[PDB]
Amino acid sequence: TLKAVSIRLKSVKNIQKITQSMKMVSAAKYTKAERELRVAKPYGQGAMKFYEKTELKGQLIIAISSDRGLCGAVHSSVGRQLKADLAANPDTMVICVGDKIRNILQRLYGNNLAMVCNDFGRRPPVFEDATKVARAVLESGMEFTNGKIVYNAFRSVVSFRTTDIPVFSKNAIESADSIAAYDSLDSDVIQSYVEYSLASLIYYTMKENATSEQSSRMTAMDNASKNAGEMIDKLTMTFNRTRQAVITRELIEIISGASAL
């Protein structure tokens, strides 16, 4: 009816206003995050260069997410990749940064969850938060030889890819085949270098994940605002047709009553 279209048109108009407001905010965050990603990408290139040169091939899994949801298919697809890890390494403890990954994966593999970080995502990722995670991996004392970090890579503005960055241990680094070519190696040097290479890889993923998350949320609100705008236009034409049909039908009823006298 005319009232139903008017109520629906009012709701879609409010949906467009919220998503347009979200699009402007998320574009501002994405612009800031990509500005810092422009310098924090070679930082991870230099950090990963050593692990590339060693050609070491792989436990623990680091999952990067945020407590802020509805950013697109970020936490769902990352958790889906994590589910594929549960079908590949069922006996690997996973350290999550974000409640959304904990919510998805607790039902399936609650027996293989080491720790889940929370109260994260609203603040921009800085090195101190990376060091908090780095200190968490060390002082927990959990055994791990190999490992990987789950994060959303920043392919483009509209495309993000879920990849993994391998992370090894001090014990695995000493046992490496090509590590004998690297000199000046003792226990304290390897231990400190590994526990800072870990805090440089975690910082690299946190910058990549934040930029990918803001980019996905920006293009999701952009699609939502365009689709709500198209739905507003069709509901406006439906409202105008229904308003005109109601006026015409009501007048014909009055004319028929007047002519029948």
Partner: protein, 134 residues
Amino acid sequence: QMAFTFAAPSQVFYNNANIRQVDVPSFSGSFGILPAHVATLAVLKPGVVTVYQEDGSTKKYFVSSGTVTVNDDSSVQVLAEEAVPVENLDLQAARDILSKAQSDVTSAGADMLKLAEGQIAVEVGEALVKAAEG
């Protein structure tokens, strides 16, 4: 031919730039780097990393911590915690933190962890005193 990747969480200095010499203060000794160096890796310590490019330009970059890695393909990856040029630093601030560190050492007492933190800040303060006054 020596690829330089001196970066930081704050700033970025060099990206695969040919440098004639970089001297790094590491825990394994405050040694220096030339192209086609020894395949090795070491842990940074509070000190003055110096950059001497192909033009011979001398640039001083004080850092607070980090990592240094030289691979077999003459690729240098120096990552530091907060690398700044030393010209935007104060020797008076360096001694103020150093005096504050000395107070922490004296007031540590049975707090051996706080004694370690006082020692750590003493090393940072002494590094900056030599950095700023040189």
